[PDB]
Design a protein around this ligand. Structure first.
Ligand code: HEM
Length: 345
C-alpha cells in the first residue's frame, strides 16, 4: 500500500491528499479477491481502530509489537516502570549532558557537518545506551552478540531499564527476550528518534521565526516537540490490525478477518500549518491504545532537550544547501527520514 507513504518533501503528495478525500475510512478490496483491506486515514477513526479490543496483530522475542493480550500485557507490565515520570526526571540531567557532549563535538569540529550521521545518530544512540544502562565499555561496539550481552547483564544487573527488568523480573524474562527489548530500543527506536532530530532540525530551519521563538522562549519546548512529531510523522503507517469479529468503525462494518491499515501520516496531516505556539496538538504520532509507544516519555524528553539546546547554542544555524535539495527516503514502510542534512553556522 505504497500510496499511504507518498510525500512532497515533508508534506503529503497530491496523490495521497486525493485518497484522503475519499473519507476517513476507505474500503480497499484487493484486485485479486484474496482479501478486503481498509485504510484508516482520519484522527478519530485511527484512534477508534487502535483502541478497540476487537483487532489483533496477526501475520497476514521481546518484541511487544508482535504480541496480543494477554502475553503483550504480561511483558509490557514488566518493562513499563522504566518509563515512569520518576525515571525520566532522574534521567533528564544525564540526557542533557549527552546532548551537550554531541553539540560540543559539533561546535568544535566547526562547520559544515552532516547532521544526521555525525550528530543526530550518535546522540540518539548514546541516549538509548544511557536509558538502557548499557555498560560503558560495551556502548561503542553495541552502537557500531545481543544474547551474550543480555545474558551477562542479566547475570549482574546494572542501572537503567535492562537492570531494573532483570533485577525485578529475573526469572520471568529470558536472555533472548531481554536482548529483544534492547534491540528494539537500539534499532527501530533510534532510527525514529534520529530521524525526528534531523528532520525536525530541518523543519525548524525552514521556519526561522519559530527557530528563534524557541530560543527566546525555551518553555515552548514541550509544545514544539508535539508539533514536530505531528508534522514529521516519521512513523508513517502501522502494522495491520485484523478484526477478530465483525466491528463497526466510523459508520462502517469491518468484517471478521479484514485488515485495517492506520495511516498516522494522513491522520496527522490531511486536515496543519507548522506552529510551535499551538498549546495542544491533535496527533497520533506515537499511536494509541495498548501498543501506544512505550518510549514516548523518553522520546519527548530527549527531543525537547535536543531542540531547545540546539537553537540556543547555534542561533546562526542554517542548511549548507538550499532546503529544496535535501534528499528524502522514497516511499517505503521504513521510517521516514532524510538521507543527509549538511548544516553550517
Ligand atoms: C519520535 C520517536 C518515536 C516515534 C514517532 C515512535 C512511534 C511509535 C508508534 C507509532 C508505536 C505504535 C506502533 C503500533 O501501534 O503499531 C510505537 C511503539 C513502540 N515504541 Fe515508539 N516511537 C518513537 C520512539 C521510541 C523510543 C525512544 C522507544 C524506547 C526507548 C520506543 C519504544 C517503543 C516500543 C517498545 C513500542 C511497542 C509498544 C507495544 O507494542 O506495546 N519508541 N512507537
Amino acid at each position: 500500500h505504497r500510496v499511504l507513504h507518498l510525500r512532497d518533501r515533508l508534506d503529503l503528495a497530491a496523490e495521497l491528499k486525493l485518497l484522503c478525500e475519499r473519507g476517513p475510512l476507505v474500503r480497499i478490496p484487493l484486485e485479486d479477491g484474496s482479501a478486503v483491506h481498509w485504510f484508516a486515514l482520519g484522527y478519530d477513526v485511527v484512534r477508534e481502530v487502535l483502541g478497540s479490543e476487537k483487532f489483533d496483530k496477526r501475520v497476514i522475542p521481546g518484541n511487544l509489537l508482535q504480541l496480543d493480550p494477554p502475553e503483550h500485557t504480561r511483558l509490557r507490565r514488566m518493562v513499563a516502570p522504566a518509563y515512569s515520570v520518576r525515571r525520566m526526571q532522574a534521567l533528564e540531567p544525564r540526557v542533557q549532558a549527552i546532548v551537550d557532549d554531541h553539540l560540543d563535538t559539533m561546535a568544535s569540529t566547526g562547520p559544515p557537518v552532516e547532521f544526521l550521521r555525525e550528530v543526530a545518530g550518535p546522540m540518539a544512540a548514546r541516549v538509548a545506551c544511557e536509558f538502557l544502562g548499557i555498560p560503558l565499555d560495551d556502548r561503542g561496539e553495541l552502537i557500531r552478540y545481543m544474547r551474550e550481552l543480555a545474558a551477562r547483564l542479566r547475570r549482574d544487573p546494572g542501572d537503567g531499564m535492562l537492570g531494573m527488568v532483570a533485577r525485578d523480573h529475573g526469572a520471568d524474562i529470558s536472555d533472548e527476550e531481554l536482548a529483544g527489548l534492547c534491540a528494539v530500543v537500539m534499532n527501530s527506536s533510534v532510527e525514529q528518534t534520529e530521524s525526528c532530530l534531523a528532520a525536525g532540525t530541518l523543519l525548524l530551519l525552514e521556519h526561522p521565526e519559530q527557530f528563534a521563538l524557541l530560543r527566546e522562549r525555551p518553555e515552548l519546548g514541550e509544545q514544539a516537540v508535539e508539533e514536530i512529531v505531528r508534522y514529521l510523522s516519521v512513523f508513517e503507517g502501522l502494522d495491520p490490525r485484523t478484526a477478530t469479529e465483525d466491528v463497526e468503525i466510523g459508520g462502517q462494518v469491518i468484517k471478521k478477518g479484514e485488515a485495517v491499515f492506520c495511516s498516522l501520516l494522513a491522520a496527522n496531516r490531511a486536515d496543519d500549518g507548522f506552529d510551535i505556539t499551538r498549546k495542544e496538538s491533535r496527533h497520533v504520532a506515537f499511536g494509541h491504545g495498548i501498543h501506544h509507544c512505550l518510549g514516548a516519555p523518553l522520546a519527548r524528553m530527549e527531543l525537547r532537550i535536543a531542540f531547545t539546546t540546539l537553537v540556543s547554542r547555534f542561533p546562526s544555524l542554517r542548511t549548507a544547501v538550499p532546503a529544496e535539495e535535501i534528499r528524502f527516503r522514497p516511499p517505503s514502510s521504513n521510517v521516514f527520514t532524510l538521507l543527509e542534512l549538511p548544516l553550517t553556522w
